[PDB]
């Protein structure tokens, strides 16, 4: 994709951070992996999974890859414009728009991912097994998938032209 | 010309004939194994429909002692 870490407006942030393992021929190795997001407070948000032998380069590489998995989002107000109740992976995702005068209200991944993405008055919820790692798939289920007033308005405008043409 | 309404063949070197199969010593003996066994269809190359038709005829004639079925004690 394209950069989401941009001078004078960058909004670096992290999500997960942990270690994972592979069982090698000898002993067992540890790969320092982590999820990140850089925002701008205006959308443009992504995610990356680094692999490293150290925690700093785990976040380095994950923010490289964050820019390579940027998704665009555009909105008005401090809240998302459309509810998306879609589910990606086995973590169940829900997402309402909500009037200003309320917080993010979420302790999971979607506390921080729903901050960087220019939203902070959104109300969201999740069901199913607790697992922050795929709460992050609310990139798919709300930011990537959306509707906007001028999208729906051009449905109503497309139809009129066809009747005239015949 | 047009509207003559049938084919001139139903014979092939691996696909059988149609519309009549019946008991009679002569005809049947060509389509069975020499040991009084019946042919496999995966060798001969016959399709199901040919095989079913032949089978019926074979077995009837066989148990009228026209085709052998004693070859392990003959």
């Amino acid at each position: 994709a394209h950069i989401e870490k941009q001078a004078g407006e960058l909004q670096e942030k992290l999500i997960a951070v942990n270690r994972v393992s592979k069982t090698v021929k000898g002993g067992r190795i540890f790969s320092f992996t982590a999820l990140t997001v850089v925002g701008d407070g205006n959308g443009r948000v992504g995610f990356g999974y680094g692999k490293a032998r150290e925690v700093p380069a785990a976040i380095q590489k994950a923010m490289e890859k964050a820019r390579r998995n940027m998704i665009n989002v555009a909105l008005n107000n401090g809240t998302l414009q459309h509810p998306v109740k879609g589910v990606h992976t086995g973590s169940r995702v829900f997402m309402q728009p909500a009037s200003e005068g309320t917080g993010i209200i979420a302790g999971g991944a979607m506390r921080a991912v729903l901050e960087v993405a220019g939203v902070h008055n959104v109300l969201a919820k999740a069901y199913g097994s607790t697992n922050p790692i795929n709460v992050v798939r609310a990139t798919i289920d709300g930011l990537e998938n959306m509707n906007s007033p001028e999208m729906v308005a051009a449905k109503r405008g497309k139809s009129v032209e066809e009747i005239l043409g015949k | 010309a047009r509207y003559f309404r049938r084919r001139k063949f139903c014979r092939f070197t691996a696909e059988g004939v149609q519309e009549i199969d019946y008991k009679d010593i002569a005809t049947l003996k060509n389509y069975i194994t020499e040991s009084g066994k019946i042919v496999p269809s995966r060798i001969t190359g016959t399709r199901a429909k040919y095989q079913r038709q032949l089978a019926r005829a074979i077995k009837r004639a066989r148990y009228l002692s026209l085709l052998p079925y004693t070859d392990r004690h003959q």
Partner: protein, 70 residues
Amino acid sequence: PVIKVRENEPFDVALRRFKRSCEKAGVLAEVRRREFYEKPTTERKRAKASAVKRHAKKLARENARRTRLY
């Protein structure tokens, strides 16, 4: 392993190993073992699994045939 058809010519070794293929196929080797209906029928469906896959193999093979690596 033989059939009732005779060989009447001088031989010391004669063809009788494709009279084996006109008799035996494991049909004298099923007389010391019991099986269920399930067992041999599933095996028949591995010899028609061979035949459908035969077509599929040819597409894969064609790419290899282009290049020389043998």
